[PDB]
Design a protein around this ligand. Structure first.
Ligand SMILES: [Mg+2]
Ligand SMILES: [Mg+2]
Ligand SMILES: [Mg+2]
Ligand SMILES: [Mg+2]
Ligand SMILES: [Mg+2]
Ligand SMILES: [Mg+2]
Ligand SMILES: [Mg+2]
Ligand SMILES: [Mg+2]
Ligand SMILES: [Mg+2]
Ligand SMILES: [Mg+2]
Ligand SMILES: [Mg+2]
Ligand SMILES: [Mg+2]
Ligand SMILES: [Mg+2]
Ligand SMILES: [Mg+2]
Ligand SMILES: [Mg+2]
Ligand SMILES: [Mg+2]
Ligand SMILES: [Mg+2]
Ligand SMILES: [Mg+2]
Ligand SMILES: [Mg+2]
Ligand SMILES: [Mg+2]
Ligand SMILES: [Mg+2]
Ligand SMILES: [Mg+2]
Ligand SMILES: [Mg+2]
Ligand SMILES: [Mg+2]
Ligand SMILES: [Mg+2]
Ligand SMILES: [Mg+2]
Lengths: 129, 141, 149
RNA sequence: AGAAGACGGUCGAACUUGACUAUCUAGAGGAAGUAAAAGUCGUAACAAGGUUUCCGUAGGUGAACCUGCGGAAGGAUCAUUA
RNA sequence: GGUGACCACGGGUGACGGGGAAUCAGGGUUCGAUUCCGGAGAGGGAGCCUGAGAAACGGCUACCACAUCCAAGGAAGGCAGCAGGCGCGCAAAUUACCCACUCCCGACCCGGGGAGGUAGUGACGAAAAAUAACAAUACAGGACUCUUUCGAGGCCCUGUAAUUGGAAUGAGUCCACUUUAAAUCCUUCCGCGAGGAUCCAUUGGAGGGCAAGUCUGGUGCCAGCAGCCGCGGUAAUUCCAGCUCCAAUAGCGUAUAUUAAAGUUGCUGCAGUUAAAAAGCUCGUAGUUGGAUCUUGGGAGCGGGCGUCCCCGCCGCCUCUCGGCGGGGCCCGAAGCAUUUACUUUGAAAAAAUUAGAGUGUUCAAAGCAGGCCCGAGCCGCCUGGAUACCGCAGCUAGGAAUAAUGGAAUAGGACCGCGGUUCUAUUUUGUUGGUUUUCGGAACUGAGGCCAUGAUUAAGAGGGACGGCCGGGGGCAUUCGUAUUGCGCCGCUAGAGGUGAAAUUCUUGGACCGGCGCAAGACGGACCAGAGCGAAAGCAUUUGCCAAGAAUGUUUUCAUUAAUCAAGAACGAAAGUCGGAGGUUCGAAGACGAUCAGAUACCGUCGUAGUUCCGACCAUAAACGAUGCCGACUGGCGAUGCGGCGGCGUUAUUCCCAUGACCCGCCGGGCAGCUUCCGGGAAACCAAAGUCUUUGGGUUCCGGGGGGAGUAUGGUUGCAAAGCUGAAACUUAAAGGAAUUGACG
């Protein structure tokens, strides 16, 4: 069933941007969704998303742009110990020149660059690039 | 698909464990059989006594007689055919003469022709065929 | 796609944004709790009350009119049933399957619909044991079931 | 003080007979496989393989085999012309 | 009583445990008997003395197991100390010299140490590194310059030769010295010590993988070659030889264990339409996995780029009931404690060697750890090192609270001198000690009040549960009918008919076949019947009744995380098959004959047993097949149809309309299906899904790792038995196979 609500959503926003779809809604919604999408907003990977408030769960509607090649999700949230952060961002991103492993540490949800500035580890969620 | 979860380190380990008794190359190595079966008791070469000289008929596409030796190994008393490599060297080896027999390179496969012959002769009465068939060291007497 | 059947259907109820009462309604939190009250008294299930109250009567949803949901209104006054309405509907059903199985020992079909039903019972039961509405002891028994309805 | 000694008890190698399990092997004679690869008797299969083929089960048969029943198409018909 | 599939218990090991090793894009994989740490045993056990300290083996006591001398009464035996030998063995050193170094025991500066060092053996292995260089010729060439080219000047070159030529050196040998303990070895050097014919480089190759000759001899499917592919049958690029070349090269070969290679064990990270492969189906305990939802925006400042936009310290809470740095504060000392963790970050602790890696003319390097210097040595001495990082998990400490669980108030409770009643008992206090009773301080208990905006998040395009009107060859149990079929009864007429690539056994004037009318028994439910229906899969169709059960839709019905998949364990499971029983309609293994055929113990015929038919037990398998696990998400079209709903525009009917109902036209959910396409997949065939996969991981179940041997043997278990389930190896084997292509033969 709905186990992981990212994988759910991120499939459907990778899986639109292939078709070139202009915008998409994501059915279940969550806090973690919002908080990881707002990360994608900063590096440009999407445009402004506007969350509907069906009284229950939430829907979102994501303005897409052309720019997202793929976003995916590492499904079990392994615990990343900062020394490993490299070994991951080697084998999970296309280059050292862009690509963003979104993860979730002590000091909020954020990309790997921002966990490195603050010097924290934590749990991998996914990656967009 | 695969089990993929996070407290699934065992279902995984124990999965990748048994699905090696379906590997062939480990069930030689880790089972028992091999050490029990190969006259060469896990041992690179072995010494044995030449009990007679036997020509073997090669596998159809290539007709020829191969010129091997029935050996009996010391350590086991297990018998053997070993193809005496290189031309006219069977001529050297006489009966009842102590030979150091090594493998063929296929470790169990019989090589090419020589149907069902894993072993090749190397030494003969502490000499080495390579020295004899070159004519460097003569036959001892 | 359902617990125990292939049919992967969806047909469900669906409420609006709005929750605030819809102004037809007179009654008030009291006169609804006066009426739930008299229906449960007469002998109806917490579902069945919610029913009578909407078709004939007026309340979209009790929950919105009063503070709490029907069961709590019965339970906090002590008109609530012995076991959950939701469960003895399964038990009553089981005992009905039992009966004709006991006359017709050929019905292979009835011998899921029993096994399934039994299993949808046990399954239910063992949260009602962790949510602690049932005491940690009660158990099905075929024999004692027919009585329990 | 005090040796040799003797009654008792305790750990207990050892020896004798059972039990188990492990491992390893002796064996009259019997039946497979493989080799392997050129003998005889057919010709089962692949072409509509001359009998669409195959599964399971059964029964039969010098041998492939054959025949029932239920299947399968991996067919030799994606159709049969209200 | 304790342990157990979070896999105990049982068995095995080519198992003394760590520290590391070689491998290695990241992750592992195997090895670690190996000098450092930890353990054990001295043929095996047991017991012993003695000892602080031992159950001590360079003690002894037996026994067992071994074995020596003998005067035959007796006696002495323990190398898994060092040397050595034997046996085993594919597989491993000298009866060497010594306390000089490091250390230890002693009563001890003084002896001893096979601990240890030093030699010898020593392609276990690692480092460095000769096996020649150079001038001039003779030439053999080729970039400037010169020449139309041929030629030449020549700064450039390089090939072979003459060695023309001397120069240089080491390998050796050996005066001498150092070394050391005495040597040896090394480092130092006198003296001798290079023209190849020497001071002499070999091992495999020379078709390809794979760098290197269809050079030349010989053999001629032999010998032989060839890890695989292969060559060899009279010119072999393949054998044996010759010459030439290539690779590495002082090393180099084959023996096999093992790692990459292996995206062929796949955590990262394989696969399951057909290639090896998804249980027949379903339930289901462990396990794994599980929606959303709860402090924030914002404030105050310092600092980058009147305000706006990045960048920092702040607004862990509570306590102060607790310390104190006659009444104090001030806040640290204590604890509510981080709900209870999981997580993350910082410490501390992590034996050295190894490792990573600071520093360093070991002549470099493996190494070594020193060295450097100051110094003309008058300095009678200075200066610096012996860096650091990692060190899993668990354990310890401290920050953070991103996510994951987990917790707290609901048949009432937190606090609020809120108040009392009951009891308790501590101790200050009555100039001291006892008694009684108090006040008070702290428990415990408990009457009765005040306040607390006093407590339930929502209902999942999750689930569970109620109700509604349909729906459906879903299941059972009754009941009813239909034909044909054979059987018989009767009657009519008459001689052939059935069967067939043709015929006969067969049935028949004892009148068969045919015709008619009657009964019979059992079968099976024709057309209607469909990419139509239902169930789980086996699955499921004459009428009617009854009996439960179910999907779907409908639903501002209720419950509220209850769920998915699931080892283990259950329910059902064509046919065939088996025990019971009932029945014998046809068909029909087996079985009998006729033909056909070279034969047919086959097909094609004619009989007909078990069984197909029923009721009762078992069995538990299919090509049980969509050769597609189940749940969950997403991505395009377009047509149709089953059900339910909804809406509309029709009308036939049907009535005055209606309600309907029957058609039409839409929409909506979930069903069975179709086509179409450069989504995107896909080896290919193909596939709305086999799509979302090097852009690798939504959850989870099963399961394959070349083919056979083999679904065999053996073991276990179930079964009355067929058999079912679990399920090896030796051996052999190079492809077997799959998808598509041309062929070519049906
Ligand atoms: Mg289920
Ligand atoms: Mg096949
Ligand atoms: Mg052993
Ligand atoms: Mg010994
Ligand atoms: Mg000891
Ligand atoms: Mg002892
Ligand atoms: Mg000794
Ligand atoms: Mg050796
Ligand atoms: Mg020594
Ligand atoms: Mg070396
Ligand atoms: Mg030399
Ligand atoms: Mg080659
Ligand atoms: Mg490997
Ligand atoms: Mg790799
Ligand atoms: Mg594979
Ligand atoms: Mg299936
Ligand atoms: Mg009919
Ligand atoms: Mg099972
Ligand atoms: Mg059956
Ligand atoms: Mg039957
Ligand atoms: Mg019977
Ligand atoms: Mg017949
Ligand atoms: Mg099967
Ligand atoms: Mg697939
Ligand atoms: Mg993958
Ligand atoms: Mg295999």
């Amino acid at each position: 069933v709905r186990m992981n609500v990212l994988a759910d959503a991120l499939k459907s926003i990778n899986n639109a941007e292939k078709r070139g779809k202009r915008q998409v809604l994501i059915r279940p919604c969550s806090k973690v969704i919002v908080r990881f999408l707002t990360v994608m907003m900063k590096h440009g990977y999407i445009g402004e998303f506007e969350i509907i408030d069906d009284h229950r769960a939430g829907k979102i509607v994501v303005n897409l742009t052309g720019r997202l090649n793929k976003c995916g999700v590492i499904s079990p949230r392994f615990d990343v110990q900062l020394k490993d952060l490299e070994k991951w961002q080697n084998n999970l991103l296309p280059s050292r020149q862009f690509g963003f492993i979104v993860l979730t540490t002590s000091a909020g949800i954020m990309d790997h660059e921002e966990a490195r500035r603050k010097h924290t580890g934590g749990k991998i969620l996914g990656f967009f690039f | 698909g695969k089990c993929r979860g996070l407290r699934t380190a065992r279902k995984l380990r124990s999965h990748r464990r048994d699905h090696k008794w379906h590997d062939k190359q480990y069930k030689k190595a880790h089972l028992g059989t091999a050490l029990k079966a190969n006259p060469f008791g896990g041992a690179s070469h072995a010494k044995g006594i030449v009990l007679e000289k036997v020509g073997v008929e090669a596998k159809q596409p290539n007709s020829a007689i191969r010129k091997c030796v029935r050996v009996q190994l010391i350590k086991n008393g297990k018998k053997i055919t070993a193809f005496v490599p290189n031309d006219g060297c069977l001529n050297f080896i006489e009966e009842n003469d102590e030979v150091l027999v090594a493998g063929f390179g296929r470790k169990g496969h019989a090589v090419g022709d020589i149907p069902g012959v894993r072993f090749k002769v190397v030494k003969v009465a502490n000499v080495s065929l390579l020295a004899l068939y070159k004519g460097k060291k003569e036959r001892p007497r | 796609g359902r617990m125990h059947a292939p049919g992967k259907g969806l047909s469900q109820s669906a409420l609006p944004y709005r929750r605030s009462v819809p102004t037809w309604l007179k009654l008030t939190s009291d006169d609804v709790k006066e009426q739930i009250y008299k229906l449960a008294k007469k002998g109806l299930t917490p579902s069945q009350i919610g029913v009578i109250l909407r078709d004939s009567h007026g309340v979209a949803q009790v929950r919105f009119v009063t503070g709490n949901k029907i069961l709590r209104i019965l339970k906090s006054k002590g008109l609530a049933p012995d076991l959950p309405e939701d469960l003895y509907h399964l038990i009553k059903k089981a005992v009905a399957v039992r009966k004709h199985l006991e006359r017709n020992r050929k019905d292979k079909d009835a011998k899921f619909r029993l096994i399934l039903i039994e299993s949808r019972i046990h399954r239910l039961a063992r949260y009602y044991k962790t949510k602690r509405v049932l005491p940690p002891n009660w158990k099905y028994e075929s024999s004692t079931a027919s009585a329990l309805v």
